[PDB]
Design a protein around this ligand. Structure first.
Ligand SMILES: O=C(Nc1ccccc1)[C@H](c1ccccc1)S(=O)(=O)O
Length: 154
């Protein structure tokens, strides 16, 4: 039975495509990518059609994890098809819950990705107005959370 996860952030050009790429690498490394549908989407329409922010690409290149995506906004269908929708911050979470209540079928469990962090850094903060170190922190959070999520979903 194929499992599925959608990572979600505000623009879908940084936090969620990083989480998506980190997770895809993890399952590929453990020989189970074929068992997973992995994707990412945005709560907003700010960046639809755009590639991941290059500041995030720079970070990912340093860690040797390839990343490619075209930003898209989450849709009503996503709530029906995904097992998990894992988002970055409380604002994302409130929007996703609002949207989920507008559809008939919500298969997805909607949660903060950070709820999986063994180090308990609950929020994955938007690094848009931040510096290199903020992108690195996002990356590290995604690694820790994705590993924990794969090991045992809530
Ligand atoms: O879209 C974003 N923020 C945002 C900030 C201001 C206006 C619109 C979007 C976020 C982002 C962070 C770093 C570099 C690019 C984008 S994301 O949610 O992580 O993708």
């Amino acid at each position: 039975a194929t499992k599925s996860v959608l990572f979600v952030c505000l623009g879908n050009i940084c936090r969620s495509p990083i989480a998506e790429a980190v997770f895809r690498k993890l399952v590929t490394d453990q020989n189970i990518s074929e068992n997973w549908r992995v994707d990412s989407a945005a709560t907003s329409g700010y960046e639809i059609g755009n590639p991941p922010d290059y500041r995030g690409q720079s970070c990912m290149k340093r860690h040797g994890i390839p990343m490619s995506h075209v930003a898209r906004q989450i849709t009503k269908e996503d709530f029906a098809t995904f097992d998990y929708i894992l988002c970055m911050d409380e604002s994302n979470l409130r929007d996703l819950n609002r949207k989920s209540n507008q559809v008939k079928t919500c298969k997805a469990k909607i949660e903060l990705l950070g709820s999986y962090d063994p180090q308990k850094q609950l929020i994955i903060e938007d690094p848009y107005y931040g510096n290199d170190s903020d992108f690195e922190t996002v990356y590290q959070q995604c690694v820790r959370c994705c590993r924990a999520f794969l090991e045992k979903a809530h």
